[PDB]
Design a protein around this nucleic acid. Structure first.
Ligand SMILES: C[As](C)(=O)[O-]
Ligand SMILES: C[As](C)(=O)[O-]
Ligand SMILES: [Cl-]
Ligand SMILES: [K+]
Ligand SMILES: [Mg+2]
Ligand SMILES: [Mg+2]
Ligand SMILES: [Mg+2]
Lengths: 401, 402
DNA sequence: ATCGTGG
DNA sequence: ACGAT
DNA sequence: ATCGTG
DNA sequence: CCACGAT
């Protein structure tokens, strides 16, 4: 009987898109974003196109009636050529007029141009890309519907959160680890989440080589907890869970030792409670299968190894492996704490803000994968480096959606 | 709603021992064995034992009331010394009086003595061994109940069969493969089953080295099909399934190639239909897990690999069975239809176990070969009388290994 | 070797 | 070692 | 790059 | 890389 909390104290069942959208119309999102300009720019090269005009009308009406963001104006900016220089001029024109976000329509598939512009925008202002070639042969309403879930989130809104019991679960969950972007290079990440699935803070390392992995893992985690604790000084962390994921160097014994060391150092500096109870978990997507009745099903493979059959004639299953690699739990509370962390992981698999029907995979694993896609391709095609440190908007918003 | 067919047209639901025993009392087993002497021998070491006396009276009453084998006489033979020669003398005395089967009580868990005597009795007469030191007033009822399931079966009875749709599944299923008895030596096996779970014929190769595996795999399958077809001349086989199991040499591509050749040779010889539709399957027990609803669940891992979540009968244990289709001549149009049928068939066969009342929840085409392998390996280890069913219609057609 | 687990 | 109908 | 599964 | 679907 799990539900999403949306606006005005209302709650709606999970797994029901139609009831969610209707819920949003009646009660609004959990948090409407507070804008500075009440202005979005739409940037395209199809000035008097009838479909740009229908796009804009659906966006304008849905922002108001579904997302309850009232009195928004959409200004258009036209670029003459679909080249970086020409598009960047309109982007810069829009920014200097004062806009809260940019909706950027590209004409065709162009990976280098996309990653160059996306990395520029990430460093500048919340943004949402669109492809005009795909838009044409597409049902517009489903297009704009899902599009605005992530754009409103990038603007700082909170579409919905999970209703969870404040007596149960982790005070915070840190999704951490690293992801390879090629055979030698990787970056480390650390993301602090509330048990209701909301991202509180994120940090990423520079792109480094696998030999630098453990050094930057500890430093990225210390960075994220320092940043989180500076902005939530009165947040008491007495129960802490780490979700470690990502295709990363296979140094499991060394990694667990450095993670355990990090927690005790954070405990040294009173970043977490005096006797914080913690567990370090490895989360791994495994081979999908199809059942030829499983929602919330937990499978025990061994004393420290579990599997969650996450649902997405036939029932496709995306199983998630969960291994408890370390914990300071007593043996009396152990099984109870196991049930809580596996429940928590299942709850977090309901919390992705990429659209209304997102992939059901824990946000602690999926959001770092979205970050990896951007970082990998910006390094591959030469865009602007993305540096969250020092930039509160990047540290506190889901810029990666 | 799967059910077992027992006697007089009656059927009882699976997974309920109480109703199955009551069903047998009311209606009899699916087939009562046809005995030659109406006599069985009980051979033991404790003439004045109250437990032996209660054992003999429970066997007598339940053979009559549960299994509907009426008017059987149970003669007794006492051996003095608990050693091979003395016991074998009483076995030989009992065989010479004219008996249908021997029930043999041994003093304790003496493994060399057991396998030497059991290999002798397998080569002679249906038999059921018991341990004197394990009998107890508390367990005697359960003891005799299950003991008789396998003994009636070894006498040629059919306790129960699976109620299955005659239009679905395989005409015959051949359980085959090999089992290593040590790092070098193995034996091959081939068993023919009806889709209702009954075993029709079984053959095993001699113990051979792993280098001889593919040769003897082919010859053993041909022997069991020649045997089935000689004794079921009109059994049309239009749909054939092979269940390949056992800890055996790593030769998957060559093994598959030989198994296909074997089927093609049996078609040429008109042992199966020249247009037989068949599949070769690898059945593998994998690591159990526990769900923290799954009865008969089929899991697809790819177009060729499947998993059956068989229940092991807070935390509920699962004993999954990997099923890989390594070869088939199915049309793409009928493929997934056929996949559903062979996976359901494997589930149904996991409900067939004539070892006792409780289902083993492992397909009979895997489990009966594991039982044979236990005997063959230990009889070689402890130097018993070698067992080979060839030329012995009794070993070929009866589940001597239970 | 009543049969199966669980240890 | 236990429990099973 | 609406986001997903095949 | 495309085909089709979602409220
Ligand atoms: C910062 As750049 C677009 O020159 O890689
Ligand atoms: C058990 As022997 C040596 O009589 O074959
Ligand atoms: Cl007693
Ligand atoms: K005895
Ligand atoms: Mg996006
Ligand atoms: Mg022999
Ligand atoms: Mg037996």
């Amino acid at each position: 009987g799990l539900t999403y909390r949306i606006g005005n104290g209302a709650s709606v069942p999970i797994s029901n898109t139609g009831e969610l959208i209707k819920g949003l119309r009646n009660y609004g999102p959990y948090e409407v974003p507070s804008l500075k300009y009440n202005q979005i720019a739409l940037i395209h090269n199809n000035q008097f196109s009838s479909l740009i005009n229908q796009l804009k009308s659906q966006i304008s009406s849905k922002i108001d009636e579904v997302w309850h963001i009232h009195n928004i104006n959409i200004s258009e900016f036209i670029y003459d050529s679909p080249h970086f220089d020409s598009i960047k001029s309109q982007v810069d024109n829009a920014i200097d007029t004062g806009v809260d976000g940019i909706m950027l329509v590209l004409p065709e598939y162009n990976t280098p141009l996309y990653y160059k512009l996306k990395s520029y925008l990430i460093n500048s202002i919340p943004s949402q890309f669109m492809r005009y070639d795909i838009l044409s042969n597409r049902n517009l309403t489903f297009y704009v519907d899902n599009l605005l879930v992530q754009f409103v989130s990038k603007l700082g809104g909170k579409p919905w959160i999970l209703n969870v019991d404040p007596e149960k679960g982790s005070d915070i969950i840190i999704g951490t680890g690293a992801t390879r972007i090629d055979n030698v290079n990787l970056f480390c990440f650390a993301m602090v989440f509330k048990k209701d699935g909301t991202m509180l803070w994120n940090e990423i390392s520079p792109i480094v080589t696998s030999s630098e992995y453990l050094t930057y893992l500890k430093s990225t985690i210390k960075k994220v907890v320092y940043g989180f604790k500076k902005s939530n000084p009165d947040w008491d962390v007495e129960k802490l869970t780490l979700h470690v994921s990502g295709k990363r160097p296979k140094m499991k014994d060394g990694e667990t030792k450095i993670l355990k060391e990090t927690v005790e150092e954070l405990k040294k500096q009173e970043m977490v409670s005096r006797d914080v109870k913690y567990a370090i978990l490895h989360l791994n997507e495994t081979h999908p299968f199809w059942v030829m009745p499983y929602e919330g099903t937990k499978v025990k493979l061994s004393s420290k190894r579990y599997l969650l059959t996450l649902l997405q004639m036939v029932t496709p299953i995306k199983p998630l492996s969960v291994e408890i690699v370390s914990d300071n739990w007593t043996s009396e509370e152990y099984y109870h704490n196991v049930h809580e962390i596996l429940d928590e992981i299942y709850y977090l698999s309901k919390m992705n803000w990429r659209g209304f029907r997102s992939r059901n995979l824990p946000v602690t694993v999926n959001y770092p994968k979205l970050v990896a896609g951007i970082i990998a391709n910006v390094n591959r095609y030469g865009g602007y480096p993305i540096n969250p440190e020092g930039n509160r908007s990047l540290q506190t918003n889901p810029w990666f959606l």
